[PDB]
From a paper:
AAA+ proteases are a family of proteases that proteolytically cleave substrates from which the substrates are unfolded and delivered to the cleavage sites driven by ATP hydrolysis. Among these AAA+ proteases, FtsH (Filamentation Temperature Sensitive Protein H) is the only known family anchored on membranes where it is able to hydrolyze both soluble and membrane protein substrates. The quality control and regulation of membrane proteins by FtsH play a critical role in cell viability and stress resistance in response to changing environments. FtsHs contain four domains: N-terminal periplasmic and transmembrane domains and C-terminal ATPase and protease domains.
Author numbering:
A (entry chain B), B (entry chain A): 158 to 266, 281 to 528, 541 to 603
The structure:
Amino acid sequence: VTFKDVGGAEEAIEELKEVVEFLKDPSKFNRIGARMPKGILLVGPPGTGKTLLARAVAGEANVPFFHISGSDFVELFVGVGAARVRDLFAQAKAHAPCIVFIDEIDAVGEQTLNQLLVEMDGFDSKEGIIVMAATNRPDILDPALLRPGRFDKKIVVDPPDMLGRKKILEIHTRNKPLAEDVNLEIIAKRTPGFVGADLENLVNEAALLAAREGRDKITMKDFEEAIDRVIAGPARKSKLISPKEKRIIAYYEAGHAVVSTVVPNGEPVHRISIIPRGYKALGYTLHLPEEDKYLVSRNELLDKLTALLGGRAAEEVVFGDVTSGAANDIERATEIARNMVCQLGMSEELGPLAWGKRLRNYSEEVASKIDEEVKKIVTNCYERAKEIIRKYRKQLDNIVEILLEKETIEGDELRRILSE
Amino acid sequence: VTFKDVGGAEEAIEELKEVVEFLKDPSKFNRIGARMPKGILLVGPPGTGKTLLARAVAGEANVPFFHISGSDFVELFVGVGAARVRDLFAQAKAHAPCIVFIDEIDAVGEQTLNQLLVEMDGFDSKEGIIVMAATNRPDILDPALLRPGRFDKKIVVDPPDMLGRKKILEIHTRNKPLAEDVNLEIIAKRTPGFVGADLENLVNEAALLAAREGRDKITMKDFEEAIDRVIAGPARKSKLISPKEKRIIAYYEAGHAVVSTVVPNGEPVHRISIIPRGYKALGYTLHLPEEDKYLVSRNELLDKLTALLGGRAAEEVVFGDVTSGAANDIERATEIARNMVCQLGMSEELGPLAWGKRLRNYSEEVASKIDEEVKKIVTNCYERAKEIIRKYRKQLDNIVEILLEKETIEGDELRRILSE
Ligand SMILES: Nc1ncnc2c1ncn2[C@@H]1O[C@H](COP(=O)(O)OP(=O)(O)O)[C@@H](O)[C@H]1O
Ligand SMILES: Nc1ncnc2c1ncn2[C@@H]1O[C@H](COP(=O)(O)OP(=O)(O)O)[C@@H](O)[C@H]1O
């Protein structure tokens, strides 16, 4: 369980390597005056992998490891926790420099608490005793533990970025017999926000779906379809859609994808489907990012707003009678335009100011000029999505009639059709 | 542990010297009628160093010292605290004039409380019994303890000013083997708001970082880099920034430093770096004050506001497309301009009045004249930062191309480049 078995956190490893060294040659840290801390506090979102790091460092240099959970101290009989703690340190002091882990310390931090503080102060840091604490919350902790001599050194763990998830997938798939067409980079970019714990569950679910039919390999189709069942839900083939009502959905989704391709700034589409899924959903479009970005320009916000108004601009041109389907793409397209004006200061009339944060302190004369700008930004974009559709209309029907039988179209075919 | 080992508080020492004298010649205070108090209450922010003063005064004249913590009285069995208190005074009365310290009295101030008040009133102040109490909160204390005869004399401790931190650093670094280029005045001015407890931790962390590589001296580079890891966090070299996206940050930070140098009133820069650090940060600039000030003029507030609008005025002139990076320098530059008008009364139209403190009691006709002034102060400054940049443009590119390879530039090189 060396450091080669943990991936996705290069700042909790490089920073936490001298502790291994300190357990090898403690003479280097006494010639100067170093006072290597007795306790280490790991903090981060739950499920990040805090517990695995302690096991990894314990196994890095052959050393006994004693794991104790603070949840076990909950609802224990009076005095049992104190006796367990005393026996733990009694065992620890008998052996060589050891590693002791205490988990879930937020809940504990009454009788066992005070006994812990006194007993911790008893032994010396030169014996070889290391205490590692892992909390899911840094605020509800007991303030007394933050005093010097107690837990004072903290390590922050963070969710992985794009390259971290690739490494985690590489780690967790070594044993299983993958097929020959499985690409782990594609599956790495379609899973943003996943903590390291969920990817193993994803692999297990893909294995289950591969095993249901019965076959010794896991193909790409199992991976891609297993991701959808986690985000939205299982497919619902029992639902019945009227033939004159599924023609509207075919035009509402084939218009959101034509507009999102013509405009310069955007991310490419992956597939379009109209199979119902989950509760209150009738069709979706998927994008895959090209890289990871941290700064957003202005022209990249006027083209994410035109795409959202693409579906509503396709019903109006074709049918002429607007439906109630596009009620969530209007709510999310009007708070994008209320940040370009109030907070980010990208309006040429109100200047570089931050009107807002209770949550409203300004006059009524000003409040009637923010609306004349919001209603002008949104209307100006909605007049351009309609203009885009009118050019690509003969090539918009072809995308529909293909989508009304196969019920799914791929991105490459779409981009081949648009560019005749 | 005499007074020579405590620095940074010259008002809790000069005021607390006759207590040492009173324990030497108590005859001077009885010829007139002095009734030197039995209890002394030390109040101040936590970690200021209240506990150290009691030990210092106890060691000033050779006298037994008995320390008891009020946190120990918490969750003790019924009657144990009273027995401990009785045994404490029983031991104290047997010896010469002694010193007894009670810590953390805010939590205690039920059964032990009443026993303390009665037993305190028992003995006489002429025996040589002194009681020192240290609380972190002056409001939650039991009001009964404020009656005469009980704790009535209080001493307030305060965080050190600029010269105090120098003395604390001098005290805590005597043993350790510093290098020859370490300047303690520079490190004293870059640590505002630090209480006396944090500087020793800073020294220990610098020692750790010096020891990691292995060398018998601590150079300046270890001190300066150890301060950053406390304020913001460790460097994150795993983060990847697109080549076309780190060119924007190089222009946003090289513009905030050119403007902050040309304007008359300001504090000099120290270094510019674009290495990511912490969470949601992509570049920072550091200043070092020349001295400590307590009054701020008006012209010193119109030049701290032009500097903040320097980054946004560098993207607009160069690229022409404003990004979302400068969203925190707009929020902090619009509450500076809402104090020059409402509270401080530095507006020539609304006169010397204080509109405001619920938090709003005035008409709507007035509320529409504060905005016409706020929008005029901010816009007038933003038209001048752009004017500054246009002059120093040939000398703004040189600062960038140097900053795109070394990833760090020093203040002296910047001020040499600007003044050709
Ligand atoms: N960086 C990582 N590399 C590989 N696997 C990880 C990583 N982080 C977390 N995991 C996986 O996530 C799972 C959950 O870990 P767990 O101990 O529950 O986290 P925590 O203790 O922080 O809740 C572990 O089985 C581990 O395999
Ligand atoms: N004025 C000072 N001079 C030198 N060291 C100080 C001073 N004030 C505080 N310290 C240091 O801060 C540390 C914390 O003191 P502590 O007793 O915890 O403060 P408090 O009791 O007020 O919380 C001590 O180890 C002491 O060395």
